[PDB]
Write a protein that binds this ligand. Structure first.
Ligand code: FES
Length: 95
């Protein structure tokens, strides 16, 4: 499956089609979108986003606790989309 991911940043928004076995971050860059990143391994906060709608699989992540997750945070470097979704990006400091 290839899923629509809408990325909302401070000043505007962009939809991209992300295959379900590619990380949101990887696809974003592939599309010329510059997101923040650091470790790229699910172990810091630098790349975090916030799901507003849809679902992701970020099973490869280790930084977010069970309540950051439930509240919708996502480490975009390690998340695959599991449906069309919408994510507010540059959410690092909320952690
Ligand atoms: S860049 Fe460190 S968690 Fe994604």
């Amino acid at each position: 499956a290839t899923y629509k991911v809408t990325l909302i940043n401070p000043t505007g928004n962009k939809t991209i089609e992300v295959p379900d076995d590619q990380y949101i971050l990887d696809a974003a860059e592939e599309a010329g979108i510059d997101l923040p990143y650091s470790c790229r391994a699910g172990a810091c906060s630098t790349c975090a986003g916030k799901l507003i709608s849809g679902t992701v699989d970020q099973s490869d992540q280790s930084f977010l606790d069970d309540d950051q997750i439930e509240a919708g945070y996502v480490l975009t470097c390690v998340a695959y989309p599991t449906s069309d979704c919408v994510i507010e990006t540059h959410k690092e400091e909320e952690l």
